[PDB]
Amino acid sequence: PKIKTVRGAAKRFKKTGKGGFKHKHANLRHILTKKATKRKRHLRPKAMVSKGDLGLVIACLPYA
Amino acid sequence: GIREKIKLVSSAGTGHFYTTTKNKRTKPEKLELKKFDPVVRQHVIYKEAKI
Amino acid sequence: TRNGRDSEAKRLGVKRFGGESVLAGSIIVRQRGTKFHAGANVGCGRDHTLFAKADGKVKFEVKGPKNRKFISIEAE
Amino acid sequence: GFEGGQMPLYRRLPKFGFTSRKAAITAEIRLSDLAKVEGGVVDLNTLKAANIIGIQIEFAKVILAGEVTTPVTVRGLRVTKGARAAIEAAGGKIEE
RNA sequence: UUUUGUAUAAUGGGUCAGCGACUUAUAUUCUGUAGCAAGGUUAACCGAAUAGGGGAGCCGAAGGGAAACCGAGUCUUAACU
RNA sequence: AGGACCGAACCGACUAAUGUUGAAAAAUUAGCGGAUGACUUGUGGCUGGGGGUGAAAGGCCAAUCAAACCGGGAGAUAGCU
RNA sequence: GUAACGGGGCUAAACCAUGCACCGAAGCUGCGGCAGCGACGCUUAUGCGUUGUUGGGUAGGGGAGCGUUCUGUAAGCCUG
RNA sequence: GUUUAUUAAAAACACAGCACUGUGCAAACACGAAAGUGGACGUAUACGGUGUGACGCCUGCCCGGUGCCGGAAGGUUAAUU
RNA sequence: AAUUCCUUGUCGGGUAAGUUCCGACCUGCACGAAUGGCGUAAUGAUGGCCAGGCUGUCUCCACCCGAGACUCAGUGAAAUUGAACUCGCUGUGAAGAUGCAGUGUACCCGCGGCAAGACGGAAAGACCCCGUGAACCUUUACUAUAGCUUGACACUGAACAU
RNA sequence: CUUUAAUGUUUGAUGUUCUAACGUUGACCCGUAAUCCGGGUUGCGGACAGUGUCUGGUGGGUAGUUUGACUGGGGCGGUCUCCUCCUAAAGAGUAACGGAGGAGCACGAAGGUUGGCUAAUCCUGGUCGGACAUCAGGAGGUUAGUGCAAUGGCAUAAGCCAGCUUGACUGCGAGCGUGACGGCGCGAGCAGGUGCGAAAGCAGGUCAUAGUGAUCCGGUGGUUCUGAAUGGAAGGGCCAUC
Numbered sequence A: 001p002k003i004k005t006v007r008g009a010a011k012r013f014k015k016t017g018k019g020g021f022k023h024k025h026a027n028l029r030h031i032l033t034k035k036a037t038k039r040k041r042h043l044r045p046k047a048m049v050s051k052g053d054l055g056l057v058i059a060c061l062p063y064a
Numbered sequence B: 001g002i003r004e005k006i007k008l009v010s011s012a013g014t015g016h017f018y019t020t021t022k023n024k025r026t027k028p029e030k031l032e033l034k035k036f037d038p039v040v041r042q043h044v045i046y047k048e049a050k051i
Numbered sequence C: 001t002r003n004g005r006d007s008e009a010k011r012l013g014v015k016r017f018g019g020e021s022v023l024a025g026s027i028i029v030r031q032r033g034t035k036f037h038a039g040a041n042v043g044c045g046r047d048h049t050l051f052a053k054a055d056g057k058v059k060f061e062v063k064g065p066k067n068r069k070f071i072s073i074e075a076e
Numbered sequence D: 001g002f003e004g005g006q007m008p009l010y011r012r013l014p015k016f017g018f019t020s021r022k023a024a025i026t027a028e029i030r031l032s033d034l035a036k037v038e039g040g041v042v043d044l045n046t047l048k049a050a051n052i053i054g055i056q057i058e059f060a061k062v063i064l065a066g067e068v069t070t071p072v073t074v075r076g077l078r079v080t081k082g083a084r085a086a087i088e089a090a091g092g093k094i095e096e
Numbered sequence E: 001u002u003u004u005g006u007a008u009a010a011u012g013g014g015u016c017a018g019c020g021a022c023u024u025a026u027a028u029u030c031u032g033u034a035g036c037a038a039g040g041u042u043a044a045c046c047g048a049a050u051a052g053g054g055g056a057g058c059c060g061a062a063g064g065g066a067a068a069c070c071g072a073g074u075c076u077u078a079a080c081u
Numbered sequence F: 001a002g003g004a005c006c007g008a009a010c011c012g013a014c015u016a017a018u019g020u021u022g023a024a025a026a027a028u029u030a031g032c033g034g035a036u037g038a039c040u041u042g043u044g045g046c047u048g049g050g051g052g053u054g055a056a057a058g059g060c061c062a063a064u065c066a067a068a069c070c071g072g073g074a075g076a077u078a079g080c081u
Numbered sequence G: 001g002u003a004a005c006g007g008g009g010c011u012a013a014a015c016c017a018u019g020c021a022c023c024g025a026a027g028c029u030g031c032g033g034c035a036g037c038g039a040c041g042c043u044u045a046u047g048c049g050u051u052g053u054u055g056g057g058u059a060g061g062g063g064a065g066c067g068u069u070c071u072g073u074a075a076g077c078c079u080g
Numbered sequence H: 001g002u003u004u005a006u007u008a009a010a011a012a013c014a015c016a017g018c019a020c021u022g023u024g025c026a027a028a029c030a031c032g033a034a035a036g037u038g039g040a041c042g043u044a045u046a047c048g049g050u051g052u053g054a055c056g057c058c059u060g061c062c063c064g065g066u067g068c069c070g071g072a073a074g075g076u077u078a079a080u081u
Numbered sequence I: 001a002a003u004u005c006c007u008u009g010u011c012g013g014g015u016a017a018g019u020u021c022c023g024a025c026c027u028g029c030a031c032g033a034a035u036g037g038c039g040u041a042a043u044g045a046u047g048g049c050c051a052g053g054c055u056g057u058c059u060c061c062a063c064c065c066g067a068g069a070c071u072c073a074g075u076g077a078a079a080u081u082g083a084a085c086u087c088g089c090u091g092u093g094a095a096g097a098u099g100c101a102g103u104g105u106a107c108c109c110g111c112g113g114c115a116a117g118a119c120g121g122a123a124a125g126a127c128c129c130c131g132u133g134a135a136c137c138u139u140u141a142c143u144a145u146a147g148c149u150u151g152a153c154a155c156u157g158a159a160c161a162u
Numbered sequence J: 001c002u003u004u005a006a007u008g009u010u011u012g013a014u015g016u017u018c019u020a021a022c023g024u025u026g027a028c029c030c031g032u033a034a035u036c037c038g039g040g041u042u043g044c045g046g047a048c049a050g051u052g053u054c055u056g057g058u059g060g061g062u063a064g065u066u067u068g069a070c071u072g073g074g075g076c077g078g079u080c081u082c083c084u085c086c087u088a089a090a091g092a093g094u095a096a097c098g099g100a101g102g103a104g105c106a107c108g109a110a111g112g113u114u115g116g117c118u119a120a121u122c123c124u125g126g127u128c129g130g131a132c133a134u135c136a137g138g139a140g141g142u143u144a145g146u147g148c149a150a151u152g153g154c155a156u157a158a159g160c161c162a163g164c165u166u167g168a169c170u171g172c173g174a175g176c177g178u179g180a181c182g183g184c185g186c187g188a189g190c191a192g193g194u195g196c197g198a199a200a201g202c203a204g205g206u207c208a209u210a211g212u213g214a215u216c217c218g219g220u221g222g223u224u225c226u227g228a229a230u231g232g233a234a235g236g237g238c239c240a241u242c
């Protein structure tokens, strides 16, 4: 049978031009008043998945 | 703890608002501060409202 | 009452020693107070971290009447 | 994705975005694909017939990708700043 | 065999003979190898039946952005040194 | 007269020795309790598995019952050996 | 059960100091041989010849082979 | 009298007696998705449940908690509208 | 005390000597009234204690009669077993040695006996812990549910008052 | 009309009665040499009872399950996140049910800036007034102070006061530190706008290091995004926030 995608993983990662994966930062959903503007500002742009985590992401997204 | 979250709303008409805490017991009067509004790109007066 | 607690080590100390070539912005020393003070081309952060304000060589020196430690950056 | 019990990366991180249904029916044409149509006229039906784009594609863009050697007439297709210059330089024509 | 460590007074086997445990299918990635190469390959089916036909599709030659959209750029921001 | 007394058959099973790869997957021998009664037994019938039946011990339900046996789900699952 | 030098035994065969001999290992050297990796060659179809070096190993990774049954090569080849 | 057939026969279970409590009969209760039945071809001096356990002398105080019985004024309250 | 920890409580009785027994005291760790209290004649293969008789239970074993054991003839098992050329001692050592070191002792092979050892045999410890194992059991654990109970609508109509 | 009584009608509420649905585990007739059932008659009840769908309560009667880990065995006790010091062997890091403590907040000023100021403690003198209150002088020299634990800091003060104030700015960010990761931290400088200062300048909270909660789902506001025939809309995205 066809490999099934980890559907929750496909809702958080997106394959980029050079094979990597972009993802949204954690800590920007709620409890935002105590958080500094600087901290929240750096958390807005998407980020790349670290070396240690690519193996896990690639296993979850065979059709990425 | 005994300190509540409050929102400071822009008088410039724009929906923009800052967020802070307030000791509602000791300081019951509504908080007013001039803060930068990024929608009108100017420093306007901001007034307290409920979070 | 009972013991058993301790906090995480904060990895403080000297990050770049005398003579090391640094680019502007590089943290030279992470400290609790001003064990070292900011000298020429060296800035002081809010947590008293000393950093490079210009590219160059890290220089440690004892200056002033209070015989204080100062970190400066010499042009290379 | 199992990490021993620790909240996995595909769970620690938040979900984002939405899928555009429009993007699925929008295609891109390389300048190399203009010479591949039978007729010297490039439109949605021509590329479709030349098997450059899918049957269900409703919108297409010509981009500065590859080369255009022959004069061609692009009709009812969006063209990028660079691809316009490329088509025009080779004696081509761009119409709505 | 298991262990930090077993002549171990730890496990297992009376002996022989025959049997007895990393397979298969479909996906997917990588290495090797072969074909062709900005292309590569067809599926069902047709069949003149391992030929030939069939290019429906799939992957690749474009990315950026949540998206509209723009496009060798794009997004970020009113704008980026 | 009597869930009366002593005591064989008959029903039981308090003690001891033997036996424990037994003569026997619960017995033998010597003693022991009941023996007209809530007694004992033959033939046939009825109650069925979270169900029966139980003067109640989780007892008994075809030689291991805190959930029978057979077949099936079935190659349950086994981060253990 | 001697059983608090391993034993015999020892007045040094004990202890201290200086010295020279010898014994002693799968270490080092000698002779012969095989292979992995380099390098360079009488001179490359990718082997061979030199030559420096390496060559304990569980889990584990990598490389190279042997043999068994069945298909083609095979109506061939071997075999009363 | 009964009991752990197969390590417990007892002080354990049962028992006559006592009390509480339910039940007006198409009884309560029990087996049954139901039909049908047991209770009972009985009828409160009867039938079920629970406890105590011949007999003698007796069975005191506590209704706060938990459980049960009764109450209807107010407060809260479902589908529905 | 079928209840009492301290505890062999204390005192009395019984015995030469009594942690048990019987009587008593009350300081009831922690009796008590149908979760029944305290008595009770009779009954009991029921528990504790004392006495007479009686004896191989014992001092302390003797003898004897039978069935095995032992010998011959016939038949003919078993559990177990890595391989055995299968000794003592002291030491060493996966820390309790026939097998290692040192040393001692011992000619080769049976038969009858004994059980100190081969951590002897049997049963993948029942104790103990562990597994995000199993089961059955409890309850004011959680979530459901049969049953019981409440109302609304349906099967379900008419007349008349207020 | 101001107001009040009473006859007709609508839908309620409450009661009384009726019979015809429905009940009969009263009697009788027939099918029928039948204690079943069915049809019929009659009596007794009667829109009640009962059953279906929905609904609140009750419900170990039955069912499925959960009921943590660390631990000088386990259990009991204690502990589980964060901050500070020592153990820690003069870079970083470093364990134990090792030795000691603290956090889960506070503050619109206790934040920003300009200007100014300088403690503790002891001795001597002084109304009430004492060992210690306030005042004066001397010694002292930061031992004080820092909203709070500890450690490092702090006089150019970071300590204490006043005037003006909102930089407790929005977008970004060369370069670094620290993490397996998720993250977390430091940062000059650039753009827009602001406060204070004559100016150089300083300000992107508080001397620093604790004061915390991923994701999902959902709420509120904004929005050149999306909007399943089309225009809207719902819902989704994006930004802010709970």
Ligand SMILES: [Mg+2]
Binding pocket: A028, A029
């Ligand atoms: Mg959000």
Ligand SMILES: [Mg+2]
Binding pocket: D051, D053, D054
């Ligand atoms: Mg096509």
Ligand SMILES: [Mg+2]
Binding pocket: none
């Ligand atoms: Mg061990």
Ligand SMILES: [Mg+2]
Binding pocket: none
């Ligand atoms: Mg060894």
Ligand SMILES: [Mg+2]
Binding pocket: none
């Ligand atoms: Mg062994």
Ligand SMILES: [Mg+2]
Binding pocket: none
């Ligand atoms: Mg064995």
Ligand SMILES: [Mg+2]
Binding pocket: none
């Ligand atoms: Mg074999």
Ligand SMILES: [Mg+2]
Binding pocket: F004
């Ligand atoms: Mg009798």
Ligand SMILES: [Mg+2]
Binding pocket: none
């Ligand atoms: Mg007998």
Ligand SMILES: [Mg+2]
Binding pocket: none
């Ligand atoms: Mg008798």
Ligand SMILES: [Mg+2]
Binding pocket: F007, F035
């Ligand atoms: Mg008799």
Ligand SMILES: [Mg+2]
Binding pocket: none
């Ligand atoms: Mg029978």
Ligand SMILES: [Mg+2]
Binding pocket: none
């Ligand atoms: Mg029991």
Ligand SMILES: [Mg+2]
Binding pocket: F073
């Ligand atoms: Mg299955």
Ligand SMILES: [Mg+2]
Binding pocket: none
């Ligand atoms: Mg299996």
Ligand SMILES: [Mg+2]
Binding pocket: none
């Ligand atoms: Mg000697």
